[PDB]
Paper text:
VPS35 (92 kDa) is the central protein component of the cargo selective trimer and is characterized by an elongated solenoid-like alpha helical structure that acts as a scaffold for the binding of VPS26 - at its N-terminal portion - and VPS29 at the C-terminal end.
Site2 is mainly located in a small superficial cleft of VPS35 between the extremities of four contiguous alpha helices.
Author numbering:
A (entry chain C): 491 to 517, 521 to 780
B (entry chain A): 0 to 182
Protein backbone atom coordinates (compact mmCIF):
# COMPACT_ATOMS: atom_id res chain seq x y z
CA UNK A 1 0.00 0.00 0.00
CA UNK A 2 1.19 3.55 0.72
CA UNK A 3 2.63 2.17 3.97
CA UNK A 4 5.60 1.44 1.69
CA UNK A 5 6.81 5.04 2.14
CA UNK A 6 7.20 4.41 5.88
CA UNK A 7 9.85 1.76 5.10
CA UNK A 8 11.96 4.38 3.25
CA UNK A 9 14.10 6.48 5.61
CA UNK A 10 17.03 8.17 3.93
CA UNK A 11 19.53 9.59 6.43
CA UNK A 12 19.60 12.73 4.23
CA UNK A 13 16.42 14.91 4.35
CA UNK A 14 17.02 16.17 0.78
CA UNK A 15 16.86 12.55 -0.48
CA UNK A 16 13.69 11.96 1.56
CA UNK A 17 12.04 14.92 -0.21
CA UNK A 18 12.83 13.45 -3.67
CA UNK A 19 11.53 10.03 -2.53
CA UNK A 20 8.31 11.65 -1.31
CA UNK A 21 7.79 13.58 -4.57
CA UNK A 22 8.41 10.56 -6.82
CA UNK A 23 5.93 8.54 -4.71
CA UNK A 24 3.24 11.22 -5.01
CA UNK A 25 3.69 11.42 -8.78
CA UNK A 26 3.43 7.64 -9.03
CA UNK A 27 -0.04 7.88 -7.41
CA UNK A 28 -7.26 6.46 -10.10
CA UNK A 29 -9.27 8.50 -7.56
CA UNK A 30 -10.55 5.49 -5.58
CA UNK A 31 -7.15 4.32 -4.35
CA UNK A 32 -5.91 7.68 -3.01
CA UNK A 33 -8.00 7.52 0.19
CA UNK A 34 -5.42 4.96 1.39
CA UNK A 35 -2.41 6.00 -0.69
CA UNK A 36 -2.02 9.78 -0.20
CA UNK A 37 -2.46 10.32 3.60
CA UNK A 38 0.77 8.38 4.44
CA UNK A 39 2.54 10.82 2.12
CA UNK A 40 1.05 13.75 4.07
CA UNK A 41 2.28 12.36 7.41
CA UNK A 42 5.69 11.55 5.86
CA UNK A 43 5.85 15.17 4.68
CA UNK A 44 5.11 16.47 8.21
CA UNK A 45 7.76 14.08 9.62
CA UNK A 46 10.30 15.45 7.10
CA UNK A 47 9.57 19.07 8.12
CA UNK A 48 10.58 18.25 11.71
CA UNK A 49 13.76 16.64 10.31
CA UNK A 50 14.56 19.97 8.60
CA UNK A 51 14.02 21.90 11.85
CA UNK A 52 16.33 19.49 13.65
CA UNK A 53 18.87 20.38 10.94
CA UNK A 54 18.38 24.15 11.37
CA UNK A 55 21.95 24.75 12.64
CA UNK A 56 23.47 22.91 9.65
CA UNK A 57 21.08 23.63 6.72
CA UNK A 58 21.06 27.25 5.50
CA UNK A 59 17.94 26.49 3.46
CA UNK A 60 15.83 24.63 6.06
CA UNK A 61 13.08 27.28 6.23
CA UNK A 62 12.60 27.27 2.43
CA UNK A 63 12.38 23.47 2.38
CA UNK A 64 9.73 23.60 5.13
CA UNK A 65 7.71 26.02 2.99
CA UNK A 66 7.98 23.57 0.06
CA UNK A 67 6.91 20.63 2.24
CA UNK A 68 3.77 22.40 3.46
CA UNK A 69 2.91 23.36 -0.13
CA UNK A 70 3.24 19.71 -1.11
CA UNK A 71 1.03 18.63 1.82
CA UNK A 72 -1.58 21.33 1.05
CA UNK A 73 -1.73 20.16 -2.56
CA UNK A 74 -1.83 16.46 -1.65
CA UNK A 75 -4.70 17.04 0.82
CA UNK A 76 -6.51 19.11 -1.84
CA UNK A 77 -6.40 16.09 -4.17
CA UNK A 78 -8.38 14.10 -1.57
CA UNK A 79 -11.01 16.88 -1.37
CA UNK A 80 -11.38 16.77 -5.17
CA UNK A 81 -11.98 13.02 -4.75
CA UNK A 82 -15.10 13.92 -2.68
CA UNK A 83 -13.67 13.38 0.80
CA UNK A 84 -14.21 15.82 3.68
CA UNK A 85 -13.65 14.19 7.08
CA UNK A 86 -10.11 12.95 6.47
CA UNK A 87 -8.83 16.09 4.61
CA UNK A 88 -10.19 18.26 7.46
CA UNK A 89 -8.19 16.21 9.95
CA UNK A 90 -5.07 16.27 7.73
CA UNK A 91 -5.32 20.07 7.56
CA UNK A 92 -5.57 20.28 11.34
CA UNK A 93 -2.46 18.09 11.66
CA UNK A 94 -0.72 20.35 9.16
CA UNK A 95 -1.58 23.44 11.18
CA UNK A 96 -0.22 21.68 14.31
CA UNK A 97 3.06 20.77 12.61
CA UNK A 98 3.54 24.22 11.07
CA UNK A 99 2.73 25.82 14.42
CA UNK A 100 5.47 23.79 16.13
CA UNK A 101 8.19 24.49 13.50
CA UNK A 102 9.30 28.13 13.63
CA UNK A 103 10.18 28.52 9.93
CA UNK A 104 9.62 31.85 8.17
CA UNK A 105 5.86 32.41 7.68
CA UNK A 106 4.91 29.29 9.71
CA UNK A 107 2.13 31.39 11.26
CA UNK A 108 0.62 32.20 7.84
CA UNK A 109 0.84 28.52 6.83
CA UNK A 110 -0.70 27.38 10.14
CA UNK A 111 -3.55 29.86 9.63
CA UNK A 112 -4.19 28.68 6.05
CA UNK A 113 -4.32 25.05 7.22
CA UNK A 114 -6.84 25.97 9.96
CA UNK A 115 -8.95 27.91 7.39
CA UNK A 116 -9.06 24.96 5.03
CA UNK A 117 -10.29 22.87 7.97
CA UNK A 118 -13.02 25.40 8.76
CA UNK A 119 -14.03 25.55 5.07
CA UNK A 120 -14.55 21.77 4.92
CA UNK A 121 -16.38 22.00 8.27
CA UNK A 122 -18.88 24.58 6.98
CA UNK A 123 -19.45 23.15 3.50
CA UNK A 124 -19.27 19.33 3.66
CA UNK A 125 -19.83 18.10 7.25
CA UNK A 126 -23.53 17.28 7.22
CA UNK A 127 -24.48 15.11 10.22
CA UNK A 128 -24.77 16.41 13.83
CA UNK A 129 -22.49 13.59 15.07
CA UNK A 130 -19.80 14.28 12.45
CA UNK A 131 -20.05 18.04 13.08
CA UNK A 132 -19.64 17.65 16.85
CA UNK A 133 -16.66 15.32 16.27
CA UNK A 134 -15.04 17.74 13.82
CA UNK A 135 -15.51 20.87 15.92
CA UNK A 136 -14.13 19.05 18.97
CA UNK A 137 -11.03 18.18 16.95
CA UNK A 138 -10.73 21.76 15.71
CA UNK A 139 -10.95 23.16 19.24
CA UNK A 140 -8.59 20.52 20.65
CA UNK A 141 -5.98 21.13 17.96
CA UNK A 142 -6.13 24.93 18.25
CA UNK A 143 -5.89 24.80 22.06
CA UNK A 144 -2.43 23.20 21.80
CA UNK A 145 -1.08 25.78 19.31
CA UNK A 146 1.17 28.64 20.47
CA UNK A 147 2.25 30.21 17.17
CA UNK A 148 -0.46 32.84 16.57
CA UNK A 149 -0.34 36.51 17.52
CA UNK A 150 -3.47 37.93 19.17
CA UNK A 151 -4.55 39.43 15.84
CA UNK A 152 -4.72 35.89 14.39
CA UNK A 153 -5.72 34.04 17.57
CA UNK A 154 -8.88 36.07 18.20
CA UNK A 155 -10.67 35.37 14.84
CA UNK A 156 -10.00 31.61 15.23
CA UNK A 157 -11.12 31.77 18.86
CA UNK A 158 -14.39 33.51 17.93
CA UNK A 159 -14.86 31.22 14.91
CA UNK A 160 -14.65 28.19 17.22
CA UNK A 161 -17.20 29.75 19.58
CA UNK A 162 -19.46 30.73 16.69
CA UNK A 163 -19.40 27.22 15.20
CA UNK A 164 -20.07 25.69 18.62
CA UNK A 165 -23.06 27.93 19.25
CA UNK A 166 -24.60 26.97 15.85
CA UNK A 167 -24.70 23.18 16.15
CA UNK A 168 -28.30 22.01 15.69
CA UNK A 169 -28.73 20.06 18.95
CA UNK A 170 -28.75 22.11 22.18
CA UNK A 171 -26.79 19.40 24.11
CA UNK A 172 -24.10 19.49 21.42
CA UNK A 173 -23.97 23.29 21.52
CA UNK A 174 -23.73 23.13 25.30
CA UNK A 175 -20.80 20.72 25.26
CA UNK A 176 -19.00 22.48 22.40
CA UNK A 177 -19.34 26.00 23.84
CA UNK A 178 -18.19 24.57 27.18
CA UNK A 179 -15.11 23.02 25.53
CA UNK A 180 -14.22 26.41 23.98
CA UNK A 181 -13.62 27.69 27.53
CA UNK A 182 -10.17 26.06 27.31
CA UNK A 183 -9.20 28.36 24.42
CA UNK A 184 -9.64 31.42 26.65
CA UNK A 185 -7.69 29.81 29.51
CA UNK A 186 -4.95 27.43 28.36
CA UNK A 187 -4.74 28.59 24.76
CA UNK A 188 -1.55 30.59 24.13
CA UNK A 189 -0.48 33.42 21.83
CA UNK A 190 2.90 34.96 20.94
CA UNK A 191 1.87 38.34 22.41
CA UNK A 192 2.04 36.81 25.91
CA UNK A 193 5.44 35.21 25.17
CA UNK A 194 3.90 31.73 24.90
CA UNK A 195 2.25 31.94 28.33
CA UNK A 196 -1.43 30.88 28.57
CA UNK A 197 -4.16 33.51 28.07
CA UNK A 198 -5.79 32.79 31.47
CA UNK A 199 -8.83 34.81 30.31
CA UNK A 200 -10.77 33.88 33.43
CA UNK A 201 -13.74 36.17 32.85
CA UNK A 202 -14.18 34.84 29.30
CA UNK A 203 -14.11 31.27 30.60
CA UNK A 204 -17.07 32.26 32.79
CA UNK A 205 -19.00 33.73 29.83
CA UNK A 206 -18.57 30.42 27.97
CA UNK A 207 -19.75 28.30 30.89
CA UNK A 208 -22.58 30.78 31.52
CA UNK A 209 -23.65 30.44 27.87
CA UNK A 210 -23.45 26.64 28.16
CA UNK A 211 -25.72 26.82 31.23
CA UNK A 212 -28.21 29.04 29.40
CA UNK A 213 -28.19 26.43 26.61
CA UNK A 214 -28.60 23.48 28.98
CA UNK A 215 -31.60 25.33 30.44
CA UNK A 216 -33.25 25.17 26.99
CA UNK A 217 -33.08 21.36 26.75
CA UNK A 218 -36.48 19.82 27.34
CA UNK A 219 -35.19 16.32 28.08
CA UNK A 220 -34.87 16.47 31.92
CA UNK A 221 -32.30 13.66 32.10
CA UNK A 222 -30.20 15.44 29.48
CA UNK A 223 -30.50 18.83 31.17
CA UNK A 224 -29.25 17.60 34.56
CA UNK A 225 -26.46 15.64 32.89
CA UNK A 226 -25.23 18.84 31.19
CA UNK A 227 -25.56 20.72 34.49
CA UNK A 228 -23.23 18.20 36.17
CA UNK A 229 -20.79 18.34 33.23
CA UNK A 230 -20.66 22.13 33.48
CA UNK A 231 -20.20 21.97 37.28
CA UNK A 232 -17.20 19.74 36.64
CA UNK A 233 -15.93 22.29 34.11
CA UNK A 234 -16.36 25.02 36.75
CA UNK A 235 -14.46 22.82 39.25
CA UNK A 236 -11.65 22.29 36.73
CA UNK A 237 -11.09 26.06 36.37
CA UNK A 238 -11.47 26.62 40.12
CA UNK A 239 -8.61 24.26 40.91
CA UNK A 240 -6.55 25.79 38.07
CA UNK A 241 -6.87 29.00 40.11
CA UNK A 242 -9.28 30.97 37.95
CA UNK A 243 -10.29 33.69 40.45
CA UNK A 244 -13.46 34.38 38.44
CA UNK A 245 -14.95 31.03 39.45
CA UNK A 246 -16.62 31.79 42.80
CA UNK A 247 -17.98 29.52 45.50
CA UNK A 248 -21.41 31.19 45.01
CA UNK A 249 -21.50 29.92 41.42
CA UNK A 250 -20.41 26.40 42.44
CA UNK A 251 -22.95 26.16 45.27
CA UNK A 252 -25.83 27.61 43.25
CA UNK A 253 -25.28 25.02 40.52
CA UNK A 254 -24.87 22.22 43.06
CA UNK A 255 -28.18 23.35 44.61
CA UNK A 256 -30.01 23.45 41.26
CA UNK A 257 -28.88 19.89 40.53
CA UNK A 258 -30.04 18.65 43.94
CA UNK A 259 -33.42 20.29 43.21
CA UNK A 260 -33.89 18.69 39.78
CA UNK A 261 -32.29 15.28 40.36
CA UNK A 262 -35.12 13.65 42.43
CA UNK A 263 -37.57 14.59 39.64
CA UNK A 264 -35.90 12.20 37.15
CA UNK A 265 -37.50 8.91 36.14
CA UNK A 266 -35.89 5.92 37.90
CA UNK A 267 -33.59 4.06 35.48
CA UNK A 268 -30.05 2.80 34.88
CA UNK A 269 -29.29 6.06 33.03
CA UNK A 270 -30.56 8.00 36.04
CA UNK A 271 -28.37 5.92 38.33
CA UNK A 272 -25.27 6.94 36.34
CA UNK A 273 -26.18 10.63 36.43
CA UNK A 274 -26.62 10.29 40.22
CA UNK A 275 -23.26 8.56 40.58
CA UNK A 276 -21.60 11.29 38.47
CA UNK A 277 -22.97 13.94 40.82
CA UNK A 278 -22.11 11.89 43.94
CA UNK A 279 -18.54 11.47 42.64
CA UNK A 280 -18.37 15.23 42.05
CA UNK A 281 -19.45 15.95 45.64
CA UNK A 282 -16.97 13.39 47.01
CA UNK A 283 -14.14 15.05 45.06
CA UNK A 284 -14.98 18.43 46.60
CA UNK A 285 -15.37 17.07 50.16
CA UNK A 286 -12.44 14.62 50.32
CA UNK A 287 -10.06 15.89 47.57
CA UNK B 1 -4.72 -14.31 37.47
CA UNK B 2 -6.01 -11.99 34.69
CA UNK B 3 -3.88 -10.64 31.81
CA UNK B 4 -5.11 -7.66 29.78
CA UNK B 5 -3.21 -6.19 26.84
CA UNK B 6 -3.56 -2.39 26.48
CA UNK B 7 -2.43 -0.72 23.25
CA UNK B 8 -3.34 1.67 20.44
CA UNK B 9 -2.32 4.63 18.24
CA UNK B 10 -0.91 2.18 15.67
CA UNK B 11 -1.75 4.61 12.84
CA UNK B 12 -1.28 1.98 10.10
CA UNK B 13 -0.93 2.90 7.30
CA UNK B 14 -1.01 6.67 7.90
CA UNK B 15 2.15 6.99 9.99
CA UNK B 16 3.57 3.45 10.14
CA UNK B 17 3.53 0.15 8.24
CA UNK B 18 3.49 -2.30 11.15
CA UNK B 19 4.36 -3.06 14.77
CA UNK B 20 8.10 -3.54 15.53
CA UNK B 21 9.30 -7.10 14.91
CA UNK B 22 10.25 -7.43 18.61
CA UNK B 23 6.72 -6.50 19.74
CA UNK B 24 5.13 -8.95 17.28
CA UNK B 25 7.44 -11.63 18.71
CA UNK B 26 6.27 -10.80 22.27
CA UNK B 27 2.58 -10.74 21.27
CA UNK B 28 1.61 -14.40 20.81
CA UNK B 29 -1.93 -15.93 20.67
CA UNK B 30 -3.45 -17.85 23.58
CA UNK B 31 -1.56 -15.87 26.27
CA UNK B 32 -3.76 -12.78 26.68
CA UNK B 33 -7.44 -12.99 27.59
CA UNK B 34 -8.70 -9.43 27.16
CA UNK B 35 -7.57 -6.64 24.86
CA UNK B 36 -8.47 -3.00 25.52
CA UNK B 37 -7.57 -0.83 22.53
CA UNK B 38 -7.52 2.99 22.52
CA UNK B 39 -8.13 3.12 18.71
CA UNK B 40 -6.40 4.75 15.73
CA UNK B 41 -5.70 1.37 14.08
CA UNK B 42 -6.58 2.79 11.56
CA UNK B 43 -8.09 0.03 9.36
CA UNK B 44 -9.89 -3.33 9.69
CA UNK B 45 -6.58 -5.09 8.97
CA UNK B 46 -5.26 -4.11 12.40
CA UNK B 47 -8.53 -5.19 14.06
CA UNK B 48 -8.11 -8.60 12.39
CA UNK B 49 -4.57 -8.84 13.80
CA UNK B 50 -5.82 -8.08 17.33
CA UNK B 51 -8.51 -10.75 16.93
CA UNK B 52 -5.64 -13.25 16.41
CA UNK B 53 -4.17 -12.45 19.83
CA UNK B 54 -7.39 -12.88 21.84
CA UNK B 55 -11.14 -13.42 21.60
CA UNK B 56 -12.20 -10.58 23.91
CA UNK B 57 -11.26 -7.36 22.10
CA UNK B 58 -12.68 -3.95 23.05
CA UNK B 59 -11.94 -0.94 20.81
CA UNK B 60 -12.88 2.73 21.02
CA UNK B 61 -12.87 5.17 18.13
CA UNK B 62 -9.75 7.20 17.28
CA UNK B 63 -9.78 10.49 15.35
CA UNK B 64 -8.36 8.69 12.26
CA UNK B 65 -10.33 5.41 12.47
CA UNK B 66 -12.17 4.58 9.23
CA UNK B 67 -14.47 2.14 11.07
CA UNK B 68 -17.01 4.42 12.77
CA UNK B 69 -18.46 1.13 14.10
CA UNK B 70 -16.40 1.63 17.26
CA UNK B 71 -17.93 3.40 20.30
CA UNK B 72 -16.52 6.75 21.43
CA UNK B 73 -15.95 5.27 24.90
CA UNK B 74 -16.50 2.07 26.84
CA UNK B 75 -16.66 0.90 30.45
CA UNK B 76 -15.54 -2.68 31.05
CA UNK B 77 -15.61 -4.52 34.38
CA UNK B 78 -12.82 -7.04 34.98
CA UNK B 79 -12.95 -8.67 38.41
CA UNK B 80 -13.01 -5.98 41.09
CA UNK B 81 -12.07 -3.18 38.65
CA UNK B 82 -14.35 -0.91 36.67
CA UNK B 83 -12.23 0.22 33.71
CA UNK B 84 -12.95 3.14 31.36
CA UNK B 85 -11.59 3.37 27.81
CA UNK B 86 -11.41 6.41 25.51
CA UNK B 87 -8.98 7.50 22.76
CA UNK B 88 -8.42 10.97 24.31
CA UNK B 89 -8.75 13.42 21.39
CA UNK B 90 -12.01 14.42 23.16
CA UNK B 91 -10.17 15.12 26.40
CA UNK B 92 -9.13 18.75 26.28
CA UNK B 93 -6.51 19.87 26.89
CA UNK B 94 -5.01 16.71 25.38
CA UNK B 95 -3.38 14.56 28.06
CA UNK B 96 -4.29 16.97 30.91
CA UNK B 97 -4.57 14.95 34.16
CA UNK B 98 -7.31 17.24 35.53
CA UNK B 99 -9.41 16.76 32.38
CA UNK B 100 -8.87 13.02 32.65
CA UNK B 101 -10.07 13.22 36.28
CA UNK B 102 -13.36 14.83 35.14
CA UNK B 103 -13.98 11.81 32.95
CA UNK B 104 -13.18 9.33 35.77
CA UNK B 105 -15.97 11.01 37.79
CA UNK B 106 -18.41 10.74 34.87
CA UNK B 107 -17.58 7.15 33.91
CA UNK B 108 -17.30 6.10 37.58
CA UNK B 109 -14.18 4.00 37.00
CA UNK B 110 -11.31 2.69 39.14
CA UNK B 111 -8.97 2.88 36.13
CA UNK B 112 -9.12 5.15 33.08
CA UNK B 113 -7.24 4.19 29.93
CA UNK B 114 -6.67 6.88 27.30
CA UNK B 115 -4.32 7.54 24.37
CA UNK B 116 -3.79 10.20 21.71
CA UNK B 117 -0.57 11.70 23.16
CA UNK B 118 1.68 8.78 21.99
CA UNK B 119 3.35 8.87 25.45
CA UNK B 120 3.11 6.09 28.01
CA UNK B 121 1.63 7.13 31.37
CA UNK B 122 0.74 5.22 34.54
CA UNK B 123 -0.07 7.10 37.74
CA UNK B 124 -2.39 7.35 40.73
CA UNK B 125 -4.38 10.49 41.53
CA UNK B 126 -6.96 10.72 44.33
CA UNK B 127 -6.82 6.91 44.71
CA UNK B 128 -7.76 6.31 41.06
CA UNK B 129 -5.47 4.83 38.41
CA UNK B 130 -4.71 6.32 34.97
CA UNK B 131 -3.02 4.47 32.08
CA UNK B 132 -1.91 5.56 28.62
CA UNK B 133 -0.18 2.70 26.69
CA UNK B 134 1.42 5.13 24.22
CA UNK B 135 1.68 4.19 20.52
CA UNK B 136 2.51 0.53 19.87
CA UNK B 137 4.13 1.47 16.54
CA UNK B 138 5.84 4.55 17.99
CA UNK B 139 3.80 6.65 15.51
CA UNK B 140 4.67 10.26 14.65
CA UNK B 141 3.04 13.02 16.71
CA UNK B 142 3.50 16.76 16.10
CA UNK B 143 3.77 17.57 19.81
CA UNK B 144 6.48 15.05 20.84
CA UNK B 145 9.69 14.35 18.86
CA UNK B 146 10.99 11.32 20.83
CA UNK B 147 8.26 8.71 20.45
CA UNK B 148 9.00 5.28 21.94
CA UNK B 149 6.95 2.23 20.81
CA UNK B 150 5.08 1.08 23.93
CA UNK B 151 2.20 -1.03 25.12
CA UNK B 152 0.90 -2.21 28.49
CA UNK B 153 -0.01 -5.52 30.08
CA UNK B 154 -2.26 -5.38 33.16
CA UNK B 155 -2.03 -8.29 35.58
CA UNK B 156 -5.30 -8.04 37.52
CA UNK B 157 -5.35 -10.06 40.77
CA UNK B 158 -8.07 -9.45 43.39
CA UNK B 159 -7.91 -5.77 44.47
CA UNK B 160 -4.45 -5.24 42.92
CA UNK B 161 -3.32 -4.54 39.37
CA UNK B 162 0.32 -4.78 38.33
CA UNK B 163 0.87 -2.91 35.08
CA UNK B 164 3.86 -3.75 32.92
CA UNK B 165 4.97 -1.17 30.38
CA UNK B 166 6.95 -2.53 27.43
CA UNK B 167 9.09 0.04 25.61
CA UNK B 168 11.33 -0.41 22.57
CA UNK B 169 14.60 1.46 23.16
CA UNK B 170 17.15 0.76 20.43
CA UNK B 171 16.72 -2.93 19.62
CA UNK B 172 16.03 -3.56 23.30
CA UNK B 173 12.71 -4.17 25.07
CA UNK B 174 12.69 -2.52 28.53
CA UNK B 175 9.99 -3.34 31.10
CA UNK B 176 8.73 -1.34 34.10
CA UNK B 177 6.32 -2.36 36.89
CA UNK B 178 3.65 -0.14 38.49
CA UNK B 179 1.29 -1.41 41.19
CA UNK B 180 -2.17 -0.03 42.06
CA UNK B 181 -4.43 -1.21 44.90
CA UNK B 182 -8.10 -0.30 45.18
CA UNK B 183 -8.83 2.01 48.18
N1 LIG C 1 -13.09 11.39 4.22
C1 LIG C 1 -13.61 10.24 4.68
N2 LIG C 1 -12.76 9.32 5.17
N3 LIG C 1 -14.96 9.91 4.70
N4 LIG C 1 -16.10 10.71 4.23
C2 LIG C 1 -16.03 11.91 3.65
C3 LIG C 1 -17.21 12.56 3.33
C4 LIG C 1 -17.58 12.93 2.03
C5 LIG C 1 -18.80 13.57 1.82
C6 LIG C 1 -19.62 13.82 2.93
C7 LIG C 1 -19.24 13.48 4.23
C8 LIG C 1 -20.07 13.71 5.32
N5 LIG C 1 -20.29 12.68 6.13
N6 LIG C 1 -20.97 12.75 7.01
C9 LIG C 1 -21.06 11.60 7.72
N7 LIG C 1 -21.84 11.53 8.80
N8 LIG C 1 -20.35 10.52 7.36
C10 LIG C 1 -18.04 12.82 4.41
Amino acid sequence: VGRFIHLLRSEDPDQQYLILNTARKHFGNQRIRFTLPPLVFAAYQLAFRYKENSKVDDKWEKKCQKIFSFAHQTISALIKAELAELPLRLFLQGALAAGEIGFENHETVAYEFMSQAFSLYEDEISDSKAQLAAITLIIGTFERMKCFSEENHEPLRTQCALAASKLLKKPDQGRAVSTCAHLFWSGRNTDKNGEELHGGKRVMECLKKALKIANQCMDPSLQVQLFIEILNRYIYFYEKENDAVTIQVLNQLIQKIREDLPNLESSEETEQINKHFHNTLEHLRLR
Amino acid sequence: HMLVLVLGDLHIPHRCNSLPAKFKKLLVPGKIQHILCTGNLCTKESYDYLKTLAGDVHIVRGDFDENLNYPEQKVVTVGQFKIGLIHGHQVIPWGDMASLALLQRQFDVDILISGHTHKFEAFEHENKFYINPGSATGAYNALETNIIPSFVLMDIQASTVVTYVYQLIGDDVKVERIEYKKP
